[PDB]
Design an enzyme around this catalytic site. Structure first.
Site, PDB file in Angstrom:
ATOM      1  N   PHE A  43       0.826  -1.199   0.000  1.00 47.76           N
ATOM      2  CA  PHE A  43       0.000   0.000   0.000  1.00 47.76           C
ATOM      3  C   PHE A  43       0.866   1.257   0.000  1.00 47.76           C
ATOM      4  O   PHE A  43       2.086   1.151   0.121  1.00 47.76           O
ATOM      5  CB  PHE A  43      -0.934  -0.024   1.224  1.00 47.76           C
ATOM      6  CG  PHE A  43      -0.229   0.054   2.564  1.00 47.76           C
ATOM      7  CD1 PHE A  43       0.240  -1.097   3.190  1.00 47.76           C
ATOM      8  CD2 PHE A  43      -0.057   1.278   3.209  1.00 47.76           C
ATOM      9  CE1 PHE A  43       0.886  -1.026   4.428  1.00 47.76           C
ATOM     10  CE2 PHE A  43       0.597   1.349   4.439  1.00 47.76           C
ATOM     11  CZ  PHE A  43       1.078   0.193   5.036  1.00 47.76           C
ATOM     12  N   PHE A  63       2.386   4.165   1.803  1.00 48.11           N
ATOM     13  CA  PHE A  63       3.641   3.663   1.201  1.00 48.11           C
ATOM     14  C   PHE A  63       4.349   2.794   2.207  1.00 48.11           C
ATOM     15  O   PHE A  63       5.208   3.264   2.968  1.00 48.11           O
ATOM     16  CB  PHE A  63       4.548   4.812   0.731  1.00 48.11           C
ATOM     17  CG  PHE A  63       3.945   5.653  -0.362  1.00 48.11           C
ATOM     18  CD1 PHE A  63       4.013   5.249  -1.690  1.00 48.11           C
ATOM     19  CD2 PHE A  63       3.323   6.861  -0.068  1.00 48.11           C
ATOM     20  CE1 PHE A  63       3.455   6.028  -2.703  1.00 48.11           C
ATOM     21  CE2 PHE A  63       2.762   7.640  -1.083  1.00 48.11           C
ATOM     22  CZ  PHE A  63       2.819   7.210  -2.392  1.00 48.11           C
TER      23      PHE A  63
HETATM   24 CU   LIG Z   1       5.371   1.339  -3.520  1.00 46.84          CU
END
Ligand SMILES: [Cu+2]
Length: 115
Positions: free
Chosen positions: A38, A40
């Site tokens: 996801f 980050f």
């Molecule tokens: Cu990434």
């Protein structure tokens, strides 16, 4: 070729909803690991697997494309929203491995392979 999943419900229902249930034993020396890539980061973090066990990584994204590369291994896969990337690997060396995403260099994950 790749298994389909609804990216809009992947965080609320199904095998990626609860990161505490990401590691499922699917045999005597076999584990399936549900990984969410996801923005980050990675879920779970860290991923904990025993050494010498056959690991089946099931990776998906709820947002954008991410990369899943485990440093020091040939695991190098693309992660697409709505699709499941499957990686089969047996970690023979205990220790910590870094998970790298090519488009997002600030995005990091960890795998701990236990003795
Ligand atoms: Cu990434």
């Amino acid at each position: 070729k790749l298994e389909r999943v609804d990216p809009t419900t992947v965080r609320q229902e199904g095998p990626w909803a609860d990161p505490a249930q990401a590691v499922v034993q699917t045999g005597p020396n076999q584990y399936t690991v549900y990984v969410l890539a996801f923005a980050f980061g990675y879920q779970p973090n860290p991923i904990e697997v025993p050494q010498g066990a056959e690991i089946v990584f099931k990776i998906t994204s709820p947002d954008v494309i991410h990369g899943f590369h485990v440093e020091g291994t040939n695991i190098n896969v693309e992660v697409l929203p709505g699709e499941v990337s499957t990686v089969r690997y047996t970690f023979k060396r205990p220790g910590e491995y870094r998970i790298i995403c090519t488009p997002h260099p600030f995005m990091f994950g960890t795998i701990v392979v236990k003795e």
